[PDB]
Amino acid sequence: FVLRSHAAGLLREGDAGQQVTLAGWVARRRDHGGVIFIDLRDASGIAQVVFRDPQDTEVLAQAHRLRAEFCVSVAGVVEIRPEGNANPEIATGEIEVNATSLTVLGECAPLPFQLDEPAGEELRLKYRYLDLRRDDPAAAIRLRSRVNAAARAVLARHDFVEIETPTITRSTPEGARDFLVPARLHPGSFYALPQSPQLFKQLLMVAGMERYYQIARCYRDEDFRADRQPEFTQLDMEMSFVDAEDIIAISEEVLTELWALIGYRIPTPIPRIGYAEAMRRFGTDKPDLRFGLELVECTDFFSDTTFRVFQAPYVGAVVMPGGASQPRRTLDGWQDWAKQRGHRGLAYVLVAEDGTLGGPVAKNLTEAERTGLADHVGAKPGDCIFFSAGPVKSSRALLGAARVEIANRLGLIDPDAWAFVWVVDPPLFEPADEATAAGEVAVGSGAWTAVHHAFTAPKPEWEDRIESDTGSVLADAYDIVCNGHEIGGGSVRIHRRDIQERVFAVMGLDKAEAEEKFGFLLEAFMFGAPPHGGIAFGWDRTTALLAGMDSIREVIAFPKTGGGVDPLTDAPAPITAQQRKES
Ligand SMILES: N[C@@H](CCC(=O)O)C(=O)O
Ligand SMILES: N[C@@H](CCCC[NH3+])C(=O)O
Ligand SMILES: N[C@@H](CCCC[NH3+])C(=O)O
Ligand SMILES: N[C@@H](CC(=O)O)C(=O)O
Numbered sequence: 099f100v101l102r103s104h105a106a107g108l109l110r111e112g113d114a115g116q117q118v119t120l121a122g123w124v125a126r127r128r129d130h131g132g133v134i135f136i137d138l139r140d141a142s143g144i145a146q147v148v149f150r151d152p153q154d155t156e157v158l159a160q161a162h163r164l165r166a167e168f169c170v171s172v173a174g175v176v177e178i179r180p181e182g183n184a185n186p187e188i189a190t191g192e193i194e195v196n197a198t199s200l201t202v203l204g205e206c207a208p209l210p211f212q213l214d215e216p217a218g219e220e221l222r223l224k225y226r227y228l229d230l231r232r233d234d235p236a237a238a239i240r241l242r243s244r245v246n247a248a249a250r251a252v253l254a255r256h257d258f259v260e261i262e263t264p265t266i267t268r269s270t271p272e273g274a275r276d277f278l279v280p281a282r283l284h285p286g287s288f289y290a291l292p293q294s295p296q297l298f299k300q301l302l303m304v305a306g307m308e309r310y311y312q313i314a315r316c317y318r319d320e321d322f323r324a325d326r327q328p329e330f331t332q333l334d335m336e337m338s339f340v341d342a343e344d345i346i347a348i349s350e351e352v353l354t355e356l357w358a359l360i361g362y363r364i365p366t367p368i369p370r371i372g373y374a375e376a377m378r379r380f381g382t383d384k385p386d387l388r389f390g391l392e393l394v395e396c397t398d399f400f401s402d403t404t405f406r407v408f409q410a411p412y413v414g415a416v417v418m419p420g421g422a423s424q425p426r427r428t429l430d431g432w433q434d435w436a437k438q439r440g441h442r443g444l445a446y447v448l449v450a451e452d453g454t455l456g457g458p459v460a461k462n463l464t465e466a467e468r469t470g471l472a473d474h475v476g477a478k479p480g481d482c483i484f485f486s487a488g489p490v491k492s493s494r495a496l497l498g499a500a501r502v503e504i505a506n507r508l509g510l511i512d513p514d515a516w517a518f519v520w521v522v523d524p525p526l527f528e529p530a531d532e533a534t535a536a537g538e539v540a541v542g543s544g545a546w547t548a549v550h551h552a553f554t555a556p557k558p559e560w561e562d563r564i565e566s567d568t569g570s571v572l573a574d575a576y577d578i579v580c581n582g583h584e585i586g587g588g589s590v591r592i593h594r595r596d597i598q599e600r601v602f603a604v605m606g607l608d609k610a611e612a613e614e615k616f617g618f619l620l621e622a623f624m625f626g627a628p629p630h631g632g633i634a635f636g637w638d639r640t641t642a643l644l645a646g647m648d649s650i651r652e653v654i655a656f657p658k659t660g661g662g663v664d665p666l667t668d669a670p671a672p673i674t675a676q677q678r679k680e681s
Contacts, residue, residue: 101171101203107143109176109190119173120145120195122162123212123231134161138172138195144188146179147172147195164538167231169204172197173544219266224665226656228548232521237575238645238653241359245566245641246313248355249333257347258335263298265315265443269615270297272551273538275320277328277450280417282680293633295585296551299336300591304622304628311334313637322660324581325639326648332638333640336590336632342576342590343632344519347585349578352635353518360644361659362516368578371522381414381498383524386582387517389505391416393497394475396485405462407445407487414497415475415484418504421458422448432484435503446484447579449477459485502582519579523524525549527604544606550575551600553619555631565660585640595623662674 102121109118122140129135132224134149149161164170174195186192210225211217213232222229229235250260269276272293279289292298295314312334319328333352337345346367354364376385379392394411403409429446436444455468463471475483484504486497500512505511527546534540541547546568548554556564560571575589592598598620602612612620638650651657656663 105141105142106138108147109193111192114176116176121171122167144192167206171201173199235522242641250351252355253311257312263295275321277317293318303338304627308338331637333635338630366519370522373524381494384579384584388515390508391631410487411417412490412493414493416484417477418482422480444484445666448483521577523572524575542606546605555592586635590631595620595626
């Protein structure tokens with residue numbers, strides 16, 4: 099019949115005396131004196147349905163079968179619950195359905211886990227369709243739909259064009275390994291899943307599309323970490339006849355509509371800091387600006403200290419307020435914490451209430467060091483100053499990571515705060531030995547590789563110095579950071595055949611090694627390529643921030659575990675011999 103005519107969660111006291119038929123799942127069942135009470139849940143909410151005197155004896159034969167998560171279709175009459183049965187916590191607090199008919203649409207076996215007691219990672223993914231029935235995962239998936247519509251609304255206001263790009267095509271370098279697809283009608287040759295639609299969106303700018311956008315699917319065989327899985331989603335954008343200012347301006351407008359979905363007006367324009375300044379003050383190119391605790395350089399301070407472990411190219415410091423009152427277990431635990439990061443340890447010097455500098459670092463001072471150490475790093479009586487020495491990037495990152503953990507233990511991060519920042523003027527190159535050490539795939543066999551991608555253009559001031567001082571080259575790129583998370587990054591592109599070949603030659607791509615890999619793109623630059631640039635947002639992390647979830651898998655409908663394991667579909671699985679033949 100009519101499986102559903104009303105919504106369960108929308109009923110009210112003014113809808114009483116109405117013959118309705120509902121459809122949904124049984125949230126709970128409780129028998130009280132022979133009367134069966136059920137909580138009927140659909141996508142709109144929960145309403146209570148009761149069974150009274152046997153209007154039909156066949157109904158009670160089925161009503162006694164009802165259990166948790168039974169999918170049913172109930173027809174009754176909305177009435178007012180008797181005095182003493184009102185639920186001020188539920189929306190439908192004073193209403194119940196006196197059922198007359200009842201149909202079991204889908205019997206439910208005893209659940210692997212109840213919807214109120216959450217389970218582990220493997221169990222929630224193996225039964226994700228049951229996990230998605232919970233309140234928080236459902237609202238997270240439905241929010242991601244409004245996030246897409248919010249981004250499409252901004253770009254549609256600016257005459258952008260939604261264009262789908264091939265996913266079975268050529269390799270695109272982004273710093274990771276490619277996912278391969280065997281060509282059936284071409285034995286030995288392999289397609290490649292796109293690490294990004296970077297190449298196709300630059301060709302679309304040569305095509306005169308001017309303004310392009312796409313919510314694309316990107317595939318990167320990375321080490322399972324951070325804000326994306328092997329298969330993740332981006333908000334891809336690209337414009338022509340624009341500079342970095344134009345792309346930042348439209349990116350801030352997209353973020354404004356996104357965070358407006360949760361009721362937070364972003365202060366436009368978002369502040370910007372340079373790459374060299376960002377790592378100088380915070381130790382990372384993606385800093386958290388919800389708290390202070392900035393790094394204090396002490397290299398000049400220890401130019402006369404006889405401590406050999408501080409006779410290094412860099413000396414950093416982070417002051418923990420009130421950190422001298424920590425027990426020995428908390429201080430010794432910081433050494434085991436710093437040991438897992440990749441350093442010899444996090445040396446510190448406590449400050450007594452009387453101002454005396456104490457700790458293992460205090461005995462190494464040079465009197466004049468003990469005089470100014472508390473005043474140089476901005477330490478108060480009772481503070482704790484964690485020091486980091488050694489190479490610049492190693493000590494900056496070790497202190498930049500130690501800076502964040504101090505905010506966690508001291509309860510310094512306000513969870514309701516939002517700290518956006520642009521990180522501009524990054525380096526365009528970095529040593530290939532430092533990238534492959536972090537598990538990244540190098541562009542070429544040379545001593546350099548791209549910091550974003552090889553198609554990033556240098557600033558016009560450093561265009562003449564791609565070959566000379568390679569490391570000093572500043573990039574025309576920009577990354578947007580939110581609460582210590584990188585949620586997006588872009589750059590102005592190279593649109594000349596000769597400059598793209600110079601950048602390729604620096605990274606170790608031979609003059610023929612580019613024609614074989616990117617000969618189509620270099621060819622397109624000979625046919626009136628416009629100045630263009632763009633940006634791509636990590637859509638999984640952006641949605642997880644808007645939803646308040648720290649794990650990005652909470653905003654993916656059917657995510658995988660760490661390592662590509664799929665508990666739901668048991669993928670990947672081997673193939674037959676007949677299937678393997680076409681390879
Ligand atoms: N808010 C969800 C479920 C109700 C709830 O959060 O308790 C909805 O719109 O149906
Ligand atoms: N006709 C709807 C039910 C009534 C409207 C519920 N929102 C359906 O079959 O899904
Ligand atoms: N986006 C284009 C116009 C798109 C609509 C053209 N009929 C521009 O800014 O020039
Ligand atoms: N293609 C870049 C984004 C961009 O440069 O526009 C990425 O995937 O991170």
